[model samples]
Target: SPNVIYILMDDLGYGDIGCFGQDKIETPHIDRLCSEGIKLTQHYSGSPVSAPARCVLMTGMHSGHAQIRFNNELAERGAVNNYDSVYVHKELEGQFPLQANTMTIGRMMQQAGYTTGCFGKWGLGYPGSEGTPNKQGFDRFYGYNCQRQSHTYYPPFLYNDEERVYLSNKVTDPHRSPLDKGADPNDPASYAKYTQKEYANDLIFDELMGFVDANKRKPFFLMWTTPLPHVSLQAPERWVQHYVKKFGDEKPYTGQAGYLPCRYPHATYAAMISYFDEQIGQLIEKLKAEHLYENTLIVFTSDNGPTFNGGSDSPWFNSGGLFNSAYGWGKCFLHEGGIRVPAIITWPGKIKPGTQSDHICAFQDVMPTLAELAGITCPPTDGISFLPTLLGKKGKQKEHTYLYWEYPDPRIGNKAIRMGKWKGIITDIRKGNTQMQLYNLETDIREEHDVAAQHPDIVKRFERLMKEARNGPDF
Candidate 1:
């Protein structure tokens, strides 16, 4: 079996990379992947949010059939919702747990006799619960066990399996800050209280490289689920300085939208992604140096699209490319900019270099694809294997009649289905609204027009699919 390295980014837009038409940010390394691999133009995330999307990806089940449907904090347990309280109580940590001994991609890789390691955000389940990385199939698990704790990039600690690895960084509330409290927002020195000596990304990346070096002799599966370019707008000083020099001076964001305020919000956001790109380039070099490059399959993609909060300039970055990344259009919504993400697959010899494909795929397809590559049995999944597409075999590839998703949010638990070029979406779930808005994607890629009245039969077909698509999750 070939080595598989899957890098799932957090809140990275489809148009955020140079290969994907990003003009501002420098992602030459990620672009190198696009040049040397197959760029999946119509790829999508499993859900619009974090935890559910990860669950969908791990279980090969869509949001309808997935165990974890939303970002559940298990808040009724008391103080679990508060970051500062959980930081001290530690026992109050973790999110909703996955059912015990559930089959996951990490486990599938283990069953295939491959070394498995997961380094970065693991929101599928809570620590010590069945949803934890070690419980789910990974031999090694390191990084954020609680995603809420992941908000601050300079967190006090991160998990190393079940134990807490305390860092040199002290506890700091990223949101509890203000320039109105007699501090200068323009002065970079004023924001020094928000930072510490130890950066979590650098630490996490070190552990990942260690995993690679130790397992270089054997075929391994790595889920490098880095929480890059998400929020709190933090990055290394050198990279931030590099972008600041290029982009020039900009107004500071002073903790208005519940994340750390940055002296240079736009520059820092771009820098955060660039830092991740720099690391990816380094990892590629490490593989080449280890003589493992030829037998490696590198897949770089995002968990979902860009975010609206944390003073992040989604519009300035144009993260969604042609897709609108406004407050309603991206992230928490069921729009194209919300779930649609950039996907690139690279193998040294097998897949054609510098090519593109319009293969519509989702995170749920990951399990079956890896299962096929590993010669393992794929437990019945909602996803069809896109291994044929990756192999560039046109006729052999199977196409889905429709791609489905129903996301439960605070306002509207939106439901969407993509059938060929047509899209049918139903919003205002709480208002008892059943009106399925239809859009021909071939014509309206942004999903501006609601033509459900024009085509009653298509809406009829979509309504039927939405009902039958969900098997329902008791958990």
Candidate 2:
């Protein structure tokens, strides 16, 4: 079995990288990855948010069939929202946990005798929980154990297996903006506190590199779920300066909208992504240097779409490409822009270089894809292998009849179904509204105009499929 490294970026958009028609941000390394592998243009995420999207990817189940369908904070526990307290005490941390002994990508790879390591955000479960990486089939885990804790780039502590690994930074609130109401947001010094000394991603990247070195000789499955380009506008200064020079000046972001403030929000956001790109370059160089590039499969993708709440300017950056990236159209909602993400795979001598495949696939397909690569069978899952598609065998590829997703969050109770080129969506489900909004993705990829009023037959077929697609979560 060849080594597999699935690098899942957090909250990155479909057009955020250079290879995916992004003009502003620099992603030359990722572009190089695309140059070497096939880009899955029609790739969709299982859910629109972090935790549930991750759950869908890890377990090879769509959100409707997965145990976690949303980001459940488990706020019933006292002080769960208090970031500092939550870090100090494990009891107050974590979102909803997956059921014990659940079939996961980690477990599947481990079962095949591969050394598995998850080196980034593990949001499915918290410390001492059954859904924790170590318990969920990973041999080693080193990063944020709590999804909520991952909100801040400079976290006080991250988890290493079952223990707490403290950082050099102080216990800072993830959502704090140092600038007061009367304070001048224009002054760069006012936003200094938001940029802390110890950046979590820098540390996490080092540990991830260590894991690769230790298992370079063995068959390993490494999930580098780095929490980069997500929120709070924190990044390394070197890249920040580079983008600052590129984009010139921009308005500062205050904490009023929800995350830490930044003097150069655009520059910082660009820096965050570019820094990650730089790391990718480093990683590829290491792989080739270690002579494992030919024996490894590297998959690069994002967990979900862009975000507006993080003081991010997705519209300015054109994050969603041809799709709108505003609130209802982005992140939490089930629009095409919200779920369709950039997916690139590079497996030397196996996949032909510089190819783009439009095969309709989602996060659920990853588990089976890897399982096929490892020459092992996974337990029952809501997915089919895309190994044929990856290998450029289009005629032999098993296509998805329909891709279904239902996010149960009351704020955005939305469900989407994609059948071939026709896409159907039902918004405001909790409000008892079942009016399906249909869009012909081939003709209207933007999902701007509603064509359901003209096509009742397709809508009814979608309604029946939605009924057949899901059951309640197993947990």
Give each prediction's root-mean-square deviation over alpha carbons.
1.4, 1.5
lDDT of each model, Cα atoms only? 0.88, 0.88
Please, what are the lDDT tens digits per residue for candidate 2 over residues 14-50?
Answer: 8999998899999999999999999999999999899
Q: Candidate 1's residue-wise lDDT over 209-281, tens digit each?
A: 9999999999999999998988988888899899999999999998778788889998899999999999999
Candidate 2 residue-wise lDDT at 265: 90
- lDDT score for candidate 2 against the true structure: 0.88
Task: List residue ranges in candidate 1 displaced over 4 A.
Answer: 473-475
What TM-score does model 2 achieve against the real structure? Answer: 0.98
